[PDB]
Amino acid sequence: AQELCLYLTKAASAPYFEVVEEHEYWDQRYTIVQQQIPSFLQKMADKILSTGKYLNVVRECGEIIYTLKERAYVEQIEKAFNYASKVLLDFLM
């Protein structure tokens, strides 16, 4: 029943990992919801929100798997946030 509950969460997470709530001057656009935090990404609750936020101020202008005691996904997020800024910061200089 640990192979099963890994088959569900592997499929019940593809929609989430293909898109933090948005709104409609820029600190009220996207804001963290505190309840719905996985409590194993709580360490990086600020780099996720900061990673996509930089992608939108440029867009409107013009794989992850869960493992225990292994942080292959915690490292995978830092490898994209370290690029999310290098495209926007360079976009303003």
Partner: protein
Amino acid sequence: LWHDKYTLRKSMIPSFMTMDQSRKVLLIGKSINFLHQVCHDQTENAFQGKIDAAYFETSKYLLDVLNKKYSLLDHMQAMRRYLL
């Protein structure tokens, strides 16, 4: 993360592991648990050889990440020049 959060349970040690071997696992586990969180980094007779193989590699790597990414030695010398 070294002084506390790890306790050698004297009661649940199997008889087929000597009391000294039980302090080399509590030290290899602690060496890897501490290497991830604080250091911010991610990676019979054959049984006795496995513990020592996991010891002479993990600890030797803990110093490398603690001398190149933090220069633990370069502070001991610098803490003598000024503070002493």
